[PDB]
């Protein structure tokens, strides 16, 4: 507003260039805004295992335009912040306690009471399974070749996979020793010709 | 702004032509901006194996409007930069260390302790498997006809496939010699007529 030979000769071009860039760079501003929101509102922090639209992995850092997370295998993934904000964010390592689910399929002949008692004994003897939570051991479904039970136990988000593996191995050992048998796919074949 | 018979007689047409081209060429400017961003921010460099929206292959070079990557087979692929930026970029060769996963399915009768000891011995004897990382060998699932273990070992991104092949061959050899048996699909057939 002071001189027309100092900025008008350059503003007439700078404004048009900026408008053209914004029109072409609209995605850039969208990503920048999404990143600013992600820094302000923290759905996930660095080092938190998250799943962003079917791409799960540990989050490394939220940058200006994209956030890079290292998956379990070890491959780096870069996701624009716009789609991260526009989609659902599943945070695996937010709640301190998570739940394990087992599906043990025993044969039909297997006694229900014995199986439930064995599963309850296995669940209780584990000190990493929170007792104040719900420990469910009940028959769930009558499968094609085996009735499968469901075991649900809550454990700290840290020692969850270890609890799962230990419980599964102990279940197999006890069932093998106790007498319960895991059945192979059973087929009933009938004959009509010698 | 100096003469109306020098540029006005041509600007009135040049501006309209440029506007029409930009309207028709909007994708061209979008691709150019995406390419500029890819050169500035480097999610992937030339010679880095990447996966861009379900199209994996070594990246050759980022051009003005598209980047050509040569897949594993040897076929060249050209992808506009706009969709490259708008999508997720998985970088396989960014982290120096990556993880291998094995799924060995042994028969139910196979002893768990012997199988785990054999797998651990195989894992440790390999000098290309990083010891400071996590070497997981534990029973993972009770399959329909075979309990399958999971082996996870970290190795340098360079000698990863070679490690996988060597470990798999050694596993087969030891299991064949040790006594462990890989089971064929087992079916339990019952009879109700002679
Ligand atoms: C464009 C509107 C922005 C509104 C910002 C709300 C403030 C959020 C702060 C939350 C702190 C945990
Ligand atoms: C349209 C906004 C462009 C912002 C450019 C940010 C600078 C990035 C430089 C990164 C160097 C590694």
Author numbering:
A (entry chain A), B (entry chain G): 136 to 329
Give excerpts from the publication.
To prevent cell lysis, bacteria have mechanosensitive channels that are gated in response to the elevated membrane tension and release solutes, restoring the turgor within the cells. One of the medium-sized paralogues is called YnaI, with 5 TM helices. Structural studies have shown that the main difference between YnaI and MscS are extended sensor paddles, which create a periplasmic indentation in YnaI, and much smaller portals in the vestibule that provide the cytoplasmic access to the pore. The TM paddles are in contact with the surrounding membrane and are therefore responsible for sensing the membrane tension, while the vestibule with the pore formed by the TM3 helices conveys conductivity and selectivity.
To further investigate this hypothesis, we explored a chimeric construct comprising the sensing module of YnaI and the conductivity module of MscS. The chimera purified under condition III and analysed by cryo-EM shows an open state with a novel pore architecture, in which we did not observe pore lipids. Upon opening, the angle between helices TM3a and TM3b decreases from 135° to 100°, which is more than in WT-MscS (135° to 120°). This leads to a funnel-like shape of the chimera pore and results in a unique positioning of the sensor paddles compared to the conductivity module, while they remain a rigid body. The outward movement of helix TM3a shifts them further clockwise (viewed from the periplasmic side) than in WT-MscS, but the paddles do not tilt within the plane of the membrane. Upon opening, the diameter of the TM part changes from 69 Å to 80 Å on the periplasmic side, while it remains unchanged at the cytosolic side. For the YnaI-MscS chimera, which inherited the pore helices TM3a and 3b and the cytosolic vestibule from MscS and therefore misses the di-glycine hinge of the YnaI pore, we did not observe the diminishing of the kink dividing the helices TM3a and TM3b and the outwards bending of the helix TM3a. Instead, pore shortening in the chimera is realised by reducing the kink angle, which gives rise to the observed funnel-shaped pore and is also accompanied by area expansion on the periplasmic side. The YnaI-MscS chimera follows this observation, as its periplasmic in-plane area expansion is ~13 nm2, correlating with a similarly high pressure required for opening.
